[PDB]
Enzyme design. Structure first.
Site, PDB file in Angstrom:
ATOM      1  N   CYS A   1      25.965-103.647  12.263  1.00 51.26           N
ATOM      2  CA  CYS A   1      27.152-103.382  13.036  1.00 51.26           C
ATOM      3  C   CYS A   1      28.463-103.299  12.252  1.00 51.26           C
ATOM      4  CB  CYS A   1      27.320-104.459  14.102  1.00 51.26           C
ATOM      5  SG  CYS A   1      26.212-104.098  15.409  1.00 51.26           S
TER       6      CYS A   1
ATOM      7  N   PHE B   1      23.552-103.054  23.824  1.00 48.06           N
ATOM      8  CA  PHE B   1      23.355-102.012  22.823  1.00 48.06           C
ATOM      9  C   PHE B   1      23.157-100.655  23.491  1.00 48.06           C
ATOM     10  CE2 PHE B   1      21.844-105.622  20.067  1.00 48.06           C
ATOM     11  CZ  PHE B   1      22.883-105.536  19.166  1.00 48.06           C
TER      12      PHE B   1
ATOM     13  N   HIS C   1      35.530-103.108  15.894  1.00 50.99           N
ATOM     14  CA  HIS C   1      34.174-103.005  16.408  1.00 50.99           C
ATOM     15  C   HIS C   1      34.018-103.912  17.621  1.00 50.99           C
ATOM     16  CE1 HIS C   1      29.858-102.983  16.783  1.00 50.99           C
ATOM     17  NE2 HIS C   1      29.799-104.279  16.531  1.00 50.99           N
TER      18      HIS C   1
ATOM     19  N   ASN D   1      27.720-101.286  22.898  1.00 52.53           N
ATOM     20  CA  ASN D   1      27.702-101.484  21.453  1.00 52.53           C
ATOM     21  C   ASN D   1      26.711-100.499  20.842  1.00 52.53           C
ATOM     22  OD1 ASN D   1      27.310-102.333  18.804  1.00 52.53           O
ATOM     23  ND2 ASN D   1      27.382-104.524  19.318  1.00 52.53           N
TER      24      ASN D   1
END
Ligand SMILES: CCCCCCCCCCCCC(=O)SCCNC(=O)CCNC(=O)[C@H](O)C(C)(C)COP(=O)(O)OP(=O)(O)OC[C@H]1O[C@@H](n2cnc3c(N)ncnc32)[C@H](O)[C@@H]1OP(=O)(O)O
Lengths: 382, 383
Positions: free
Chosen positions: B155, B206, B295, B328
């Site tokens: 990530c 995700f 992020h 994500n």
């Protein structure tokens, strides 16, 4: 703040597992531990592959007790990736750290001056990666900038030099630790009557790690001295090469594809890489330079030597590394670099490049990808 | 060797996502139905609250219910399915990647032959030759394009490909670096189990996506190049006392990941020291006087960082918006945030590509625990 002048290799370190595979004894070993001794004709072909490989010995971490502890590893195709991963996520960073330490010893500087860590391996994959564990095992700064490059293949030795060059030259004081490491427990498996492709890999691939320190503006004040300058880099895909070299992470472990055309494809294309690389330098005699060539196979060296009419002195170090270690993938080409400079010194040559000024470094791997680095030697002070 | 003068800048940004969409409000039922787990009523309600608090409205997903029909092994918890996942992802990961590169090349407006380097990261697969090779062939790049394949970063990889592109674009005059991230979560989809709350979290947050940038130094306005963000400095670090808190492992059962609950606190408790090191040479101490490209690893990470630093409501608008519309997406997410930041700023008539601010910071977080930091400078929007 950018660096002045070109990036250079300041130190080299290599490491191999202790356990040794004598190639004269490997046909008997392989077919016994894989309980395939009844395949006499296959063993006969495998014996000829091993005898023709010009490999005297390899080092390998995987030993017979690993095979008895997990007989699944001696079968041909069988879900084993977890068992291999469990071993390699530990051993790959460990062996890599072994090579890193020796390179730092030669370098002779505090590990706190290592600003970057490049790590490449085709034998495993994990997050965090082998760069993290190798950095921790070395006691590097937690803020070391890492470049993890999993599953490159045997061209990867040229890659880390290419990456290190741009980093070193663009960051004054940057000192790049680049390490390759592979352990063939990732792809060890038993024989099948339908695969000579498998047997070729089972005979040539060995274990090893190689590390270099790369940096610009070497500081003789504190004991730094370069061995090879990195002058220019290139990477290309050879035409009509698709599918010829492949490697895949599967439930059975690492499964590879290896086409018989690979030696001819490299030989028929390598001269264009030399022209493209040396035309600006005004060099056309491929015997007036030194070579640091990945010994992907006896045949590759033989055919390149043949097509270019190279004197036999050019691949001497490549063949010596292939004889004592086999094909170790990305690291191999840095083993050859190290041998070239150790032989030059021991034979009293005027430079670290066998007495020559200019040289070329080649890696070959999946693509079929060719990594090229034009390199320059350093005079040897006597 | 002729090197470039001045800093490396992002010159174009393009993104892409699979077509099939998962609505978060329906995902608890959909997930527990296709996984034949509706009898885990207490685990499903547990999973329903994770999705409710995730602040994710939708995600894009390549894996659909027909895929699960063709291969029921993918809906069990821990079955050997890697080969089946790889068979899909060695194809789809470069494809989706190429889609994002194609949009970046479109905005850039320059010939593909001008691309001298290609950086590709992805955590969803691994192969030799890799996604970089195939993405280049799909795009028609020169066979001599210099590739930098970085599998299984995770990530933080969005910051990594920027840090790698900076040194390349600045040490090589004329170098134009195509950097792309792409992840598809068929690599880690799997059925639930009462003994794995980490999995439930991952199955909720995700999503799939790709993002590509064109990075170069000495931009040429004459030919139509227009910078978006300047890459000023970079850092990577391992947070202390963070061992094992973020992980991902390629196994016979596919990608197995670890996510310790302390990740928000560890990031928020260490982030200011990353800011001090990054901005003290520039003479900046007020973390509200700069823009953020963060992020959005999870709602809790943004929340805790927001509290610790008392950041004002403008900082995490783009992170939270990308999180709501995509979840994500691993390495590409932070690039989705960059794109929205410069797009929203023009739609709103802000002074710069960074919400009117001059200086900014880009953060990626991932396995290590690793933090990738990039000090960035915006470019004025002239009206
Ligand atoms: C252990 C786990 C490994 C894990 C790996 C880690 C990660 C790495 C990932 C990437 C992996 C991909 C690769 O692996 S990249 C390696 C590049 N290296 C080469 O590419 C070798 C160049 N070649 C040679 O060096 C010589 O070929 C050699 C092998 C020494 C032999 O020496 P020789 O001079 O005798 O040559 P012959 O033609 O007489 O061959 C004699 C017999 O073997 C058959 N044969 C040969 N080559 C074959 C092939 N290709 N296919 C199928 N049959 C092949 C022939 O047909 C004949 O058989 P027959 O006709 O029935 O009698």
């Amino acid at each position: 703040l950018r660096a002045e002048g070109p990036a250079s290799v300041l130190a080299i370190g290599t490491a191999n597992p202790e356990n040794i595979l004598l190639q004269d004894e490997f046909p008997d070993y392989y077919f016994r531990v894989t309980k395939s001794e009844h395949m006499t004709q296959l063993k006969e072909k495998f014996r000829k592959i091993c005898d023709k490989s010009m490999i005297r010995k390899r080092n390998c971490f995987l030993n017979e007790e690993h095979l008895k502890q997990n007989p699944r590893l001696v079968e041909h195709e069988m879900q084993t990736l977890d068992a291999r991963q469990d071993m390699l996520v530990v051993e790959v960073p460990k062996l890599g750290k072994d090579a890193c330490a020796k390179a730092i010893k030669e370098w002779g500087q505090p590990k706190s001056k290592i600003t970057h860590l490049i790590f490449t391996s085709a034998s495993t994959t994990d997050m965090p990666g082998a760069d993290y564990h190798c950095a921790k095992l070395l006691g590097l700064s937690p803020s070391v900038k890492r470049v993890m490059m999993y599953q490159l293949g045997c061209y990867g030795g040229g890659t880390v030099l290419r990456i290190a060059k741009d980093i070193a030259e663009n960051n004054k004081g940057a000192r790049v630790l680049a390490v390759c490491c592979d352990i063939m427990a990732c792809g060890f498996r038993g024989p099948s009557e339908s695969d000579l492709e498998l047997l070729v890999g089972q005979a040539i691939f060995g274990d090893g790690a190689a590390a270099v320190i790369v940096g610009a503006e070497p500081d003789e004040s504190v004991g730094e001295r370069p061995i090879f300058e990195l002058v220019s880099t290139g990477q290309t895909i050879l035409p009509n090469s698709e599918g010829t070299i492949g490697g895949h992470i599967r439930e059975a472990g690492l499964i590879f594809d290896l086409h018989k055309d690979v030696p001819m494809l490299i030989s028929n294309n390598i001269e264009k890489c030399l022209i493209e690389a040396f035309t600006p330098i005004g060099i056309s005699d491929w015997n007036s330079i030194f070579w640091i060539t990945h010994p992907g196979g006896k045949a590759i060296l033989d055919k390149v030597e043949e097509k270019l009419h190279l004197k036999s002195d050019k691949f001497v170090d490549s063949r010596h590394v292939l004889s004592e270690h086999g094909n170790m993938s990305s690291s191999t080409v840095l083993f050859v670099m190290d041998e070239l400079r150790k032989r030059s010194l021991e034979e009293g040559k005027s430079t670290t490049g066998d007495g020559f000024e200019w040289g070329v470094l080649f890696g070959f791997g999946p693509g079929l990808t060719v990594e090229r680095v034009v390199v320059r030697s350093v005079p040897i002070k006597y």
